[PDB]
């Protein structure tokens, strides 16, 4: 069925080029609110314990996620076995001496793969014993995503959560843009008579997008929709390069 996956991905490239000519986007409009997405979280290869507990924190962060083990899983048959499992997103974590550095999000049914550098992390497994996470299907909040690339990353980044939470649904997850650095925290709260009081729990980090390829994770022949430009002579002069 390699001719089937090639024909469907060639149809996908045509649909993306046609939508970019006549500019929820094209890749997600079939399943914007119907199917609750499932997320497979993996590490790089022979992970460290600190990276593994960070991946456990990420699996606990956004629901319908399993933390699949990664040792001697070859990447192409990994992603096609994930396709035959028929889940939706893959999330790969690359570390450096226990500090995680790369978070690759791949919406693998012929969809986009974004890649994020992941700068200042804080792990609740090595700070705070306060109990379990809340694990309710959360609310999401986003701060000044106004660029077209910002709308694209907020689409592929909020289309991995549980669709349609309730009013009582407690935990909120923030994605704040502070000059092309998506800062992530997540909180629970109550409503006081004075107002609202938040409680920081779970991870915190900030991620900078650096590649956003139209193909799947394994190919490396994927046409680049966007990647940053580190070495132009106007790099530090604008945002969403």
């Amino acid at each position: 069925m390699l001719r089937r996956q090639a024909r469907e991905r060639r149809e996908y490239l045509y649909r993306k080029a046609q939508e970019l000519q006549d500019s929820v986007d094209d890749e997600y409009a079939a399943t914007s609110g119907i199917m609750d997405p499932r997320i497979i979280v993996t590490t790089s290869r022979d992970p460290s314990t600190r990276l593994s507990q960070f991946a456990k924190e990420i699996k606990l962060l956004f629901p319908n996620a399993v933390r699949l083990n990664r040792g001697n899983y070859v990447m192409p048959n990994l992603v096609d076995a994930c396709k035959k499992s028929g889940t939706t997103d893959l999330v790969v974590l690359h570390e450096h001496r226990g500090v995680p550095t790369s978070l690759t999000i791949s919406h693998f049914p012929h969809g986009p793969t974004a890649q994020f550098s992941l700068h200042n992390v804080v792990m609740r497994h090595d700070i705070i014993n306060a109990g379990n996470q809340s694990e309710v299907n959360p609310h999401l909040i986003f701060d000044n995503f106004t660029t077209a690339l910002g709308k694209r990353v907020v689409c592929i980044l909020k289309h991995l959560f549980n669709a349609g939470p309730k009013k009582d649904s407690e935990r909120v997850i923030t994605f704040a843009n502070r000059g092309d650095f998506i800062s992530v925290r997540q909180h629970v709260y109550v409503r006081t008579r004075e107002g609202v009081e938040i409680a920081e729990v779970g991870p915190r980090f900030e991620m900078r997008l650096f590649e956003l390829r139209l193909g799947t994770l394994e190919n490396k022949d994927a046409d680049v929709e966007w990647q940053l430009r580190r070495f132009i002579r106007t790099a530090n002069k604008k945002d969403y390069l």
Partner: peptide, 11 residues
């Protein structure tokens, strides 16, 4: 988290 936080903030 919510249990002990809400109990300590109301009481």
């Amino acid at each position: 988290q919510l249990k002990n936080l809400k109990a300590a903030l109301k009481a």
